[PDB]
């Protein structure tokens, strides 16, 4: 899959406004969502060349397991209660939900496992000046597991990977025109020695479109336009820009 | 909404401006009598005169102030789909209730 995207940010200050605005531009409400991502690297004990049985220069990369956490495993207070995601995010700022996230990695709270989104991405498309961030993603869905060691952690080890780092993200997304999505988000590093919000101070803004093609230059070029239109329409309110490629490279590093 | 107040403050400033006119109009006809040598109402001439100055200075502060306020308001921070979609039911449902039993 091809993910064309634009990024930016707002302090928690700007959120309230941005929201009211984004709802009008898109005509849909923001919808509350979250997801945990667990990153894995090749087992540093094993060691392998960078070539195939089909002499191909192939680089080691990280794997990313992603999925939803039902909010019941995430939220601090019922008193706050409510359905509203933005006023709720202030509640979440600076610091962690229950987490300790290890628990879920190996079941608990005699067990099989969930579905995951197993992904691996390449550095965004080399480009002298790109109007948009264009990134390739290889994905498969894991449906459930079976066998002796059926915990997701066992599975990853069986395949020769090792857990590297992880993070939770909670936000609202806007469903929009021609597959355009806008996520207003917050990210939290999850370690065993406690959790900290990566996005502390505000929200990561991501406007994107996943395209099935890649090899339909036309739909690719259409997609560029879509993103451009957005950045443009909001220009003078918020700049959507292309992130540094180097900063989106999940390789060995 | 409660801005309808600020709206009425300006619509009244508007009537203040139509007074700048109404007042200085007397200043016109009254200075008519005055240079005609008939010093008859010279005090009254002075009155409606500082009054045209007064009305426009009040208007001047009032709309200038209103502009300051709008800048301050500016500094301060489809809807169709939403309510309508649900509310469909609320009316037809309540009415279907009504034709089933009543009074």
């Amino acid at each position: 899959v091809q993910q064309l995207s634009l990024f930016g940010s707002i302090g928690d200050d700007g959120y309230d406004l941005l929201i009211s605005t984004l709802t009008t531009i898109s005509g849909n409400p923001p919808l509350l969502y979250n997801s945990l991502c667990t990153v894995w690297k090749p087992n540093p004990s094993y060691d392998v060349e960078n070539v195939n049985s089909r002499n191909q220069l192939v680089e080691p990369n990280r794997i990313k397991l992603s999925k939803e956490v039902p909010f019941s495993y995430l939220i601090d207070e019922t008193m706050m209660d409510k359905p509203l995601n933005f006023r709720i995010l202030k509640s979440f700022t600076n610091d962690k939900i229950p987490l300790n996230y290890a628990m879920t990695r190996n079941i608990l709270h005699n067990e099989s496992c969930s579905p995951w989104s197993l992904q691996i991405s390449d550095i965004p498309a080399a480009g002298n000046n790109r109007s948009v961030s264009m990134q390739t993603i290889a994905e498969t869905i894991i449906l459930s597991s079976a066998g002796k060691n059926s915990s997701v952690s066992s599975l990853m080890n069986g395949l020769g990977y090792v857990f590297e780092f992880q993070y939770l993200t909670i936000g609202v997304k806007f469903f929009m025109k021609h597959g355009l999505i806008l996520e207003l988000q917050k990210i939290w590093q999850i370690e065993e020695a406690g959790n900290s919000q990566i996005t502390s101070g505000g929200f990561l803004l991501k406007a994107y479109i996943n395209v099935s093609r890649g090899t339909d230059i036309d739909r690719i070029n259409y997609t560029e336009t879509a993103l451009m239109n957005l950045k443009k329409e909001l220009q003078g309110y918020i700049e959507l820009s292309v992130p540094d490629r180097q900063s989106m490279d999940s390789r060995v590093a | 909404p409660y801005i309808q107040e600020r709206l009425k403050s300006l619509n009244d400033i508007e009537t203040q401006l139509c007074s700048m006119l109404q007042e200085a109009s007397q200043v016109t006809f009254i200075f008519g009598e005055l240079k005609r040598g008939n010093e008859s109402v010279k005090p009254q001439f002075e009155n409606h005169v500082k009054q045209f100055y007064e009305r426009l200075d009040k208007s001047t502060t009032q709309l200038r102030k209103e502009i300051q306020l709008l800048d301050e308001n500016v500094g301060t921070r489809a809807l169709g789909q939403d309510t309508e979609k649900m509310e469909e039911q609320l009316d037809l449902l309540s009415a279907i209730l009504d034709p089933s039993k009543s009074k």
């Binding site: 990024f7 930016g8 940010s9 707002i10 302090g11 928690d12 991502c37 990153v39 990280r62 991405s121 590297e164 780092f165 993070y167 990210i187 590093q189 990566i198 996005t199 502390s200 101070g201 505000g202 929200f203 990561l204 820009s241 992130p243 540094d244 180097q246 900063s247 989106m248 490279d249 999940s250 590093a253 | 200075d57 001047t60």
Partner: peptide, 22 residues
């Protein structure tokens, strides 16, 4: 009447998400 007239680094955030560089 007379008078006179960022919350953080976008790039680095992303850097983290991809490598765990913080």
């Amino acid at each position: 009447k007379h008078d006179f007239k960022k919350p953080f680094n976008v790039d680095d955030v992303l850097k983290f998400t991809f490598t765990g560089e913080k």
